[PDB]
């Protein structure tokens, strides 16, 4: 049922239903980001998604995207759509040798 | 006294575990543990006049219950299952737990019962009442890495928080 | 309803305002944005992950799973969790 994700752009925390459509996701980004769904594109892994399918039909499960380990998703916003660019987070420093 | 102080200290860390269930019944325990994987455990108050706390743990046969004994400032598993010399004593009931948990983690004990009579307690992961503090979820994580917290690149105040709960479960 | 949280390397995070109020230090301060200038991004992302893990599993109805914390960021995120009071 519930499936917890992370929309990341150049990151949004949210939960969704396994039966929710991919178009239903573009409506949630419209609320906060204030951009129309027609000006939106999603990219699970490196693959675009049809707005008619659901999250499960695109490979999202409550076992894969738990709240403690949420599977993340990407977004690409003039004339043409932009490219999907997501910047990783900082690198955790080296382990102190005692904790190694 | 030394007993009275160490006693209240034992319950105070028991409140920090997040897997202490206070006033709970066996039937409430049997239900909350009916679906958990083998090895899941919890600690609750005991319904016997001579016992305070009791371990409720899931096995392949279903949930079962073991009582914890207190005698002259020492915690140990119920002495009616084995000779007392084979039942290690402790100060904090949490240290008792962490010891029997870490033994199974070290594969010094398995889910099958020994045939030479010694105590057999299979414990894996605890069952939490509520999601603990993120702070506490590192105190656990850090303790699974090292027991020399005072040799860490930490502020002294943070280390004193670690020293209050030194266990790995 | 939503809040934006900024890290040291500038990474922006948008979570439910209820998810952010589990942290006590954030609750006192509530524009609808907060800049954390000591907490790097790799730590800032996990605290929000703890926020969901806290809201979803405040009830014991569902079996609470363990929160996975890698030992490398444990030192840092303990200091951050003490900052945010969560
Ligand atoms: C793990 C382990 C177990 C044993 C022997 N254990 C028992 O035979 C206990 C006795 C007991 C009963 C209540 C109790 O709770 P309380 O009295 O409130 O403390 C404490 C102990 N019987 C049961 O479990 C049967 C049962 C099961 C589910 C229920 F829903 C109700 C009852 C020896 C070694 C060992 F390694």
Numbering used by the authors:
A (entry chain B): 1 to 10, 13 to 79, 82 to 104
B (entry chain A): 30 to 198
C (entry chain C): 17 to 46, 57 to 112
Sentences from the paper on this structure:
The Src homology 2 (SH2) domain recognizes phosphotyrosine (pY) post translational modifications in partner proteins to trigger downstream signaling. Here, we use structure-based design to target the SH2 domain of the E3 ligase suppressor of cytokine signaling 2 (SOCS2). SOCS2 can tightly bind to adaptor subunits ElonginB/C and scaffold subunit Cullin 5 and RING domain protein Rbx2, to function as substrate receptor of Cullin 5 RING E3 ligase complex CRL5SOCS2. In this work, we describe the structure-guided design, using fragment-based growing, of a pY-based covalent small-molecule binder targeting the SOCS2-SH2 domain.
With the structure of 9 in hand, further optimization attempts focused towards engaging an attractive hydrophobic groove identified between His149 and Thr93 (named "HT" channel). It was hypothesized that this channel could be readily accessible by further modifications of the 4-fluorobenzylamino group, particularly meta-substitutions. We therefore next synthesized compounds 11, 12, 13, 14 by introducing methyl, ethyl or allyl group at position 3 of the benzylamine to form favorable hydrophobic interactions with the HT channel. To reveal the ligand binding modes, we solved crystal structures of SBC2 soaked with 11, 12 and 13.
